Symmetry: C2
């Protein structure tokens, strides 16, 4: 049910969004960004270095992650 998209990085970070089933959208905190412990609890499994950095307003069931692009 949980789907991870392809990654897409820029000259600094590496992004990737996760698509949570809308049935679970209510379990996603609305006023604060999640911490690894939190998003890991919704069932999101991924590299520890992924950081929830922003809320996708239009579609809050779509979590927005990103991680530091090595070397610079």
């Amino acid at each position: 049910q949980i789907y991870y998209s392809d990654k897409y990085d820029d000259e600094e970070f590496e992004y990737r969004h996760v698509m949570l089933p809308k049935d679970i959208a209510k379990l996603v905190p609305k006023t604060h960004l999640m911490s690894e412990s939190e998003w890991r609890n919704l069932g999101v499994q991924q590299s520890q270095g992924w950081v929830h950095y922003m809320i996708h307003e239009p579609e809050p069931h779509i979590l927005l992650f990103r991680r530091p692009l090595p070397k610079k």
Copy 2:
């Protein structure tokens, strides 16, 4: 766009499946499994080791991948 499911695994293999936009699902061959060269050409980006192991006719937009449990 292309989406990758979560992973599960039996005793020997670690399974996962890719969901392709109906647009590219047109290009998914119906007569044979795809080689790494083939799926990568579609856009499916994954580490080597993951192999298109089974054809799923009822849903041409869902590619079933597999990998041997890491050594």
